[PDB]
Amino acid sequence: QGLTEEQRMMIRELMDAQMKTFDTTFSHFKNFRLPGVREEAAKWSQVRKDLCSLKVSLQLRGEDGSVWNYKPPADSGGKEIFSLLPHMADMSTYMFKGIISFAKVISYFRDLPIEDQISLLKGAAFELCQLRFNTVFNAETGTWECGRLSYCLEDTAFQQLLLEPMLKFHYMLKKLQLHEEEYVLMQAISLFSPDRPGVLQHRVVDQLQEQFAITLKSYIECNRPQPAHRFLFLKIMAMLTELRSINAQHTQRLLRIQDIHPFATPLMQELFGITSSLTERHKILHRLLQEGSP
Amino acid sequence: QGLTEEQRMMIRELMDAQMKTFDTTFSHFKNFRLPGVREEAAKWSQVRKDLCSLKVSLQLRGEDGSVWNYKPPADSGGKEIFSLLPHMADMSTYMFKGIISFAKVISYFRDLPIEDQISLLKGAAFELCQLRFNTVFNAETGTWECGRLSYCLEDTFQQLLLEPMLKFHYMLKKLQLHEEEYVLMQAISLFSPDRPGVLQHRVVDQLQEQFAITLKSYIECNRPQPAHRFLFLKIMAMLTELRSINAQHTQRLLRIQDIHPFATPLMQELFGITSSLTERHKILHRLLQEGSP
Amino acid sequence: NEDMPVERILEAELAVEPKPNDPVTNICQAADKQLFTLVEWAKRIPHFSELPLDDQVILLRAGWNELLIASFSHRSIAVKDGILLATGLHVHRNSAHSAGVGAIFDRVLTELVSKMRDMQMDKTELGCLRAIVLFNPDSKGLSNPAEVEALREKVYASLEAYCKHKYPEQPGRFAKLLLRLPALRSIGLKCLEHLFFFKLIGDTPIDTFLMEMLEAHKILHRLLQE
Amino acid sequence: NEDMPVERILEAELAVEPKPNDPVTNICQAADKQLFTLVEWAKRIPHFSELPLDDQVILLRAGWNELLIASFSHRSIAVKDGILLATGLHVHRNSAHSAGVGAIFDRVLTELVSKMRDMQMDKTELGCLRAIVLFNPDSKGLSNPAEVEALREKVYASLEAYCKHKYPEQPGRFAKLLLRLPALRSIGLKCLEHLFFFKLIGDTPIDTFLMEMLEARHKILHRLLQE
Numbered sequence A: 001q002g003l004t005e006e007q008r009m010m011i012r013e014l015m016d017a018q019m020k021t022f023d024t025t026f027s028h029f030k031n032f033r034l035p036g037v038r039e040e041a042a043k044w045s046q047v048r049k050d051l052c053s054l055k056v057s058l059q060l061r062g063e064d065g066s067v068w069n070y071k072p073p074a075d076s077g078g079k080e081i082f083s084l085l086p087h088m089a090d091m092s093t094y095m096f097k098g099i100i101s102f103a104k105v106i107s108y109f110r111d112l113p114i115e116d117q118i119s120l121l122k123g124a125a126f127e128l129c130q131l132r133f134n135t136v137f138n139a140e141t142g143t144w145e146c147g148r149l150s151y152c153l154e155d156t157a158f159q160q161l162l163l164e165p166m167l168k169f170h171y172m173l174k175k176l177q178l179h180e181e182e183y184v185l186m187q188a189i190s191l192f193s194p195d196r197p198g199v200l201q202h203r204v205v206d207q208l209q210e211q212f213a214i215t216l217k218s219y220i221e222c223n224r225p226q227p228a229h230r231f232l233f234l235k236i237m238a239m240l241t242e243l244r245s246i247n248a249q250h251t252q253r254l255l256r257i258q259d260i261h262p263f264a265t266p267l268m269q270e271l272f273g274i275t276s277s278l279t280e281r282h283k284i285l286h287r288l289l290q291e292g293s294p
Numbered sequence B: 001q002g003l004t005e006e007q008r009m010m011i012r013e014l015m016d017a018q019m020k021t022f023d024t025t026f027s028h029f030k031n032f033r034l035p036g037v038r039e040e041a042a043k044w045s046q047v048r049k050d051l052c053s054l055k056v057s058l059q060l061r062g063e064d065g066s067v068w069n070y071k072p073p074a075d076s077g078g079k080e081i082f083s084l085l086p087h088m089a090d091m092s093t094y095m096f097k098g099i100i101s102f103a104k105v106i107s108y109f110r111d112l113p114i115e116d117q118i119s120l121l122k123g124a125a126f127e128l129c130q131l132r133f134n135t136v137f138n139a140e141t142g143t144w145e146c147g148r149l150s151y152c153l154e155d156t157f158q159q160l161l162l163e164p165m166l167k168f169h170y171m172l173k174k175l176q177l178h179e180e181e182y183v184l185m186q187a188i189s190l191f192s193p194d195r196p197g198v199l200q201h202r203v204v205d206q207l208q209e210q211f212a213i214t215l216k217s218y219i220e221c222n223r224p225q226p227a228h229r230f231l232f233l234k235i236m237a238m239l240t241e242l243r244s245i246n247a248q249h250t251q252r253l254l255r256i257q258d259i260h261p262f263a264t265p266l267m268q269e270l271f272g273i274t275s276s277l278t279e280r281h282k283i284l285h286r287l288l289q290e291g292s293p
Numbered sequence C: 001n002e003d004m005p006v007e008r009i010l011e012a013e014l015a016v017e018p019k020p021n022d023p024v025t026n027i028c029q030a031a032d033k034q035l036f037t038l039v040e041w042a043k044r045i046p047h048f049s050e051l052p053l054d055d056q057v058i059l060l061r062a063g064w065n066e067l068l069i070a071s072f073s074h075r076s077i078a079v080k081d082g083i084l085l086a087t088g089l090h091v092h093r094n095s096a097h098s099a100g101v102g103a104i105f106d107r108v109l110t111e112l113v114s115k116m117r118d119m120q121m122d123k124t125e126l127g128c129l130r131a132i133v134l135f136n137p138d139s140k141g142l143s144n145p146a147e148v149e150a151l152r153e154k155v156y157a158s159l160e161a162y163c164k165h166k167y168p169e170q171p172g173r174f175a176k177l178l179l180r181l182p183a184l185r186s187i188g189l190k191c192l193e194h195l196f197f198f199k200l201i202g203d204t205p206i207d208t209f210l211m212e213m214l215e216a217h218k219i220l221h222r223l224l225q226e
Numbered sequence D: 001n002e003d004m005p006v007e008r009i010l011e012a013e014l015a016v017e018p019k020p021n022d023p024v025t026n027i028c029q030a031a032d033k034q035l036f037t038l039v040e041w042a043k044r045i046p047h048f049s050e051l052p053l054d055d056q057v058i059l060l061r062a063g064w065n066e067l068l069i070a071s072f073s074h075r076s077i078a079v080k081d082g083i084l085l086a087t088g089l090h091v092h093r094n095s096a097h098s099a100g101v102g103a104i105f106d107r108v109l110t111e112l113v114s115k116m117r118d119m120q121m122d123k124t125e126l127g128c129l130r131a132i133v134l135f136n137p138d139s140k141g142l143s144n145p146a147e148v149e150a151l152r153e154k155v156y157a158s159l160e161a162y163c164k165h166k167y168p169e170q171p172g173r174f175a176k177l178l179l180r181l182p183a184l185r186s187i188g189l190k191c192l193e194h195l196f197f198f199k200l201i202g203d204t205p206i207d208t209f210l211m212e213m214l215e216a217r218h219k220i221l222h223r224l225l226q227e
């Protein structure tokens, strides 16, 4: 609507890919692990800080309407706070696999060298994942409604859980009331990022990113009430900007946790480089980027 | 404390039996299974009726302080009402075992022929189970706080009392009984001469009368008076309704078992599911001796 | 004491009963015969009748079989083996077992008849126990249970005073009389189980008032209107 | 519009410049030297001073790295190859990789220096971008982020009008300018990782103001704002 043919082509494409690679009902998230029915001490305190603010109740509904509801333990002194980590790992892996499929379906990403595909996916995995989660995030009740599953945030007395940049990011992104096109456009911008460490076709990625950014700007310009939504692009850009911080700090945090308590799936180990050449360093990722064998 | 020596001897023996054989924390209720993560239909309606009443949520802890909380499904979804049945069965079996042990420790019960022990236990198993379930029952939250586990009554309120069992639990909890009174009720209903296969009718009769008199005396001695004068009466009303409840349950559980087998072998023996006495109750008979390990 | 006179209940019991074939039919027309009788007796209890008529019919519909059973169990005291009826019929073991009601018959014998025999229960205490059974406040559908509990308690107190006074030699007799309620309850249940079973089959007398008792009104309802 | 005058931001930019000896030391001294200048530049931006003092402190502590980075990245346009410090010092590739900061160096060149160069970014645009970075409402401890937000989007509006007016032949120049913010953020974080690592060792003679910025009263920054 009101865009050039190439822009609307990009939007239609992104929408198609999102549609084909994002199971919002999570009906195919199966066989996931469930929570069972000196410097060491300082870093341990660190990891504890990391987990204390990110506690969620795990609601699970059944075929017949039966609902099993998990609540995490209050912090003590050991493993009792590392109870959801396997499940979180499985969820993360499912989402990541979805993101990789998403990147594959897009033509531009598919025309890039495999090494650049690896680099871009490495740099944008967690970001895209977070965006998609914001798509099913319920700001009203503070819950991620993943079809059968639901991740509700645990109370403390709200204003003090916004001192975690991730939750604040989800609330502030959900307040923006974005269309699907805008979400998938953000995904496109963060995905095609030239600043990512091991990219070779920096030129093409840059051109593409600028094109997507302009497409987004123009979409806000044409498909929303004129002065009600003029600073929307600014807010979205701020979001894409904080997304970086979130990504870095999530990486280092996950590192700190894995360091004293291994839990992360091989795919996660690859996406965050946990132990070269790009293809041997990411055999799983690299394998997922080639088709098929169905 | 106005009793004879033999009376307080009874009370002491009973209190000890209870203390030894009743685990209020349920720490040894383990390995139990949990809910999954023409005329036939005429029966289906009836069994349905039977089930949509006793809908309880299964709250389970912990020891990291975690809480797994299960909520039962809405009715149909047919067959999704039988989700708690296996767990409920295991629970009933554990309780029944505790009760059996409680019967064994008691000297008088031990002096009876094994046949009379079997008959008495059969007749009073469920009643004793309800009396032992009432002590851990919370009248305010409508919850059976079995230590780690909790079973909470799901709402619809006055229509909860229209089920004789819930009404029984609230009514009995309202009397605010002491442990002695509880174990004495257990004693009275356990030593019932009117049980179907009782050979030593006279001895059982005598024991029961002594227990009832002992309970009466306890009521008139360790309670204010005349504040708790009709207390023995309300207790006898409970022992009276407990019969109706016993039978009603029995028939109901039969009607559930007929279309949907779930009862444990012990429950099958206790309630006559699928001639001689000991042959018919191998497990019970075996539990009434000592001892293989 | 005076609000629930024990002698009032005693006379309530005395003004009601001073003194091929098929046994099932017999027991039926007997219960049927004793139902109107039962209504008269009930109407003879203090405070039974200023009660809401609905609550009255509920109480009667709840306790009728226990009342009748207690009554003929007490009656058959005089006779040796077997059970004596209000129709002057003397039903025995063999006949009861042939009728398929042998078990419940033996139960009523050894749990009630024999207990009333050895304990030497009198008709005053019988009346009081039946008054206890009648005043069952835990009967669903009542408009005001409160009165019912209160009455039950009155009868209880009166009976306990009666037993303490009249029978000083046996201190635990009252509790023994109350101890007959759970036994009578399970028996009343097992009897109904036969009646419903016999209603199903049709080879036995319909009986009409008994029929009305075997359902979920108007006969009873009008009988209470006087 | 004219409430956040773009020319005022431009002169705010013009008032603060007109221009392996342990290259790490050199960068630290350059930064320290430019932190006071950063305070002055900040105070020269409209409405920044009529904010709560502690909010100013917060914004500066949150943005200083990105601001300085944008500054020297835009300074390095004039030179062909390398990065020109504010101390007239020209840092090159070889020493940057020899200093263990080669990757972030190359990333700064490609993402910022190169892009700013090709795009022909002027200084009022740079000043507007840096102003946007400065007015970050999502900072921690803000007594009120609403005003900060209003200011940010005023700079936004002024910049968009500026790009409409000045570059009618480049319809998507504004979005392209804003598109630098995420890249700048990653570069900023990645520079912080270094500064902390170099400080942890104590190998480099860090200076007072930089140390104050790297630590989390504080003294200096709270002073330079009272004037």
Ligand SMILES: [Mg+2]
Residues within 6 Å of the ligand: C098
């Ligand atoms: Mg025969």
Ligand SMILES: [Mg+2]
Residues within 6 Å of the ligand: D097, D098
């Ligand atoms: Mg070197």
